[PDB]
């Protein structure tokens, strides 16, 4: 009697009963377990950053130098500037410009002016300009002074024409005095590798080009290589997608 009170008989043999049980019995808890299970391909928070070489560069803090800097803010600023601007190249104590540092310490020139002077120094020339073609010089200028790889061939054409017509000093001033440098860094911020994140207006290829230019936290833009500091992006810039074999 009690069994029949339950309801009218349902025909036996439904193939959907296994799905009915899953849908019915605590769908919320099963849903939570489904949600919080691990994914098939395990990726940590910094998986992309470590598959790229530049994990540590992104994690690196931004450095700023305002007017009433006491001592070690200045000492750290100098090391950060010399490490980034000179492309992680070794700078011996003889080559270090003491007068520019004195001007910076007094505050006559901002950090941006000091960067400009370093770019016009003899170390910057002797390493990046005098030993490389103009393409490599433009790429190094972009990567160091602006923190990003070149976006297209128009940049190379414009900068090569500007150099040939107005000199190295004007070539460098076009970088530092540009609106882009003042937007991203401004006067008081040491430049950093900002191309690893998406930069407003960048090309699809800029990230890949900066990857080509980076070469690890250890690696540097010496010109002491057996190759002799040749350019890296000669064919990537003018023919972005395609590959050719002569």
């Amino acid at each position: 009697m009690a069994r029949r009170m339950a309801g009218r008989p349902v025909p036996k043999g439904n193939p959907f009963l296994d799905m009915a049980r899953e849908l019915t019995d605590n769908r919320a808890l099963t849903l939570v377990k489904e949600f919080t299970a691990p994914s098939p391909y395990q990726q940590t928070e910094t998986y992309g950053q470590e598959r790229i070489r530049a994990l540590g560069t992104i994690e690196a803090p931004r450095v700023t130098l305002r007017a009433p800097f006491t001592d070690e803010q200045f000492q750290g600023a100098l090391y950060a500037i010399y490490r980034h601007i000179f492309g992680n190249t070794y700078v011996m104590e003889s080559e270090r410009p003491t007068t520019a540092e004195s001007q910076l310490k007094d505050g006559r020139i901002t950090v941006r002016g000091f960067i400009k002077l370093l770019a016009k120094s003899e170390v910057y020339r002797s390493r990046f300009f005098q030993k490389t073609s103009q393409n490599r010089f433009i790429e190094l200028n972009h990567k160091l002074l602006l923190g990003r790889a070149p976006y297209d061939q128009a940049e190379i054409s414009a900068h090569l024409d500007l150099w040939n017509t107005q000199g190295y000093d004007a070539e460098i001033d076009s970088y530092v005095e540009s609106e882009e440098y003042l937007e991203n860094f401004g006067e008081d911020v040491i430049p950093y590798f900002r191309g690893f994140k998406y930069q407003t207006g960048q090309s699809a290829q800029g990230f890949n080009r900066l990857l080509d230019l980076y070469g690890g936290w250890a690696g540097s833009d010496t010109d002491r290589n057996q190759s002799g500091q040749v350019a890296r992006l000669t064919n990537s810039l003018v023919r972005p997608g395609q590959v050719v074999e002569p």
Partner: protein, 172 residues
């Protein structure tokens, strides 16, 4: 980048000849029907957050695997990166729609996204799926004859579909 006019000009220049009557007529027709193109681009720009929201909802319902911990779009930052990528691709498709040529799309936007996503480890196939989801969610807004003069815009629907499909096929 090029619009349609600049592309026709470049081809006429490579042939070293003036613009023919036929090409002038095609460009005049494009100009006369460019008003509907403006409306289509306005539809894309006014409803961008809605398109992204629909695409992301349907993608992560379709693929619980991404948002799921350990997956790609999990850590609550990579999710914002995903939404930003949807933003960028939709923006570039809108640019290519206004221009009339896919030059902005395949030049500024998607030359290296294949290898960028392979380097960052993201699954490009899910990105292409997301792009075509954006296509579907955008067509309903593009067709919407609400508050807009009724006409025929089959060519514009085809153009927008082709641009979204080009983006998906390139990134895939």
């Amino acid at each position: 980048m090029n619009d349609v006019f600049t592309r026709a000009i470049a081809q006429a220049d490579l042939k070293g000849s003036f613009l023919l009557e036929s090409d002038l007529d095609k460009l005049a027709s494009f100009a006369k029907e460019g008003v509907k193109r403006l409306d289509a681009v306005a539809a894309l720009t006014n409803n961008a957050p809605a398109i992204i929201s629909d695409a992301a909802h349907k993608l992560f319902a379709e693929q619980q695997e991404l948002i799921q911990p350990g997956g790609n779009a999990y850590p609550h930052r990579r999710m914002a990166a995903c939404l930003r990528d949807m933003e960028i691709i939709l923006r570039y498709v809108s640019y290519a729609l206004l221009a009339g040529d896919a030059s902005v799309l395949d030049d500024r936007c998607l030359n290296g996204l294949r290898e960028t996503y392979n380097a960052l480890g993201t699954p490009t196939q899910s990105v292409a799926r997301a792009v075509q989801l954006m296509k579907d969610a955008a067509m309903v807004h593009l067709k919407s004859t609400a508050n807009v003069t009724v006409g025929d815009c089959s060519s514009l629907y085809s153009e927008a579909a082709t641009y979204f499909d080009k983006a998906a096929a390139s990134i895939a």
